[PDB]
């Protein structure tokens, strides 16, 4: 083993998590035990990371990365957005699905 117990475990701010760096997005993953998404998110940016959807899982780079149909991550990210100023739609009930 090499990285047994990390020294520092915390984040300055996640209100944007969009302008982040390609090296930070990763640290955030391992921080929550998500080293499996680091590979596909190696060159990912806070912005691209938050722009991830269950649909993006069906295809690469993020594909069958976990046995949770990309739930653990989707949930870990969903929060990264709720913070940012992203006015989501209101109406509920699509035409086709």
Curated annotation (Swiss-Prot):
Q: When the coding gene is removed by deletion, what phenotypic consequences does the entry describe?
A: Null mice have hearing impairments with stria vascularis (SV) in these mice exhibiting atrophy and disorganized marginal cells resulting in significantly smaller endocochlear potentials (EPs). These decreased EPs, together with abnormal KCNQ1 expression patterns, increase with age. There is a decrease in plasma, liver, and macrophage sphingomyelin (59%, 45%, and 54%, respectively) and a dramatic increase in glycosphingolipids. No change in ceramide, total cholesterol, phospholipids nor triglycerides levels. Diminished macrophage MAP kinase and NFKB1 activation is observed.
Outline the extent of the SAM domain: 20-83
Subcellular location, record wording: Golgi apparatus membrane
Tissue note: Isoform 1 is widely expressed, isoform 2 shows a more narrow distribution and isoform 3 is detected only in testis and heart.
The similarity comment for this entry is: Belongs to the sphingomyelin synthase family.
According to its UniProt entry, what is the function of this protein? Major sphingomyelin synthase at the Golgi apparatus. Catalyzes the reversible transfer of phosphocholine moiety in sphingomyelin biosynthesis: in the forward reaction transfers phosphocholine head group of phosphatidylcholine (PC) on to ceramide (CER) to form ceramide phosphocholine (sphingomyelin, SM) and diacylglycerol (DAG) as by-product, and in the reverse reaction transfers phosphocholine from SM to DAG to form PC and CER. The direction of the reaction depends on the levels of CER and DAG in Golgi membranes.
State the protein's name. Phosphatidylcholine:ceramide cholinephosphotransferase 1
> From which source organism is this entry?
Mus musculus
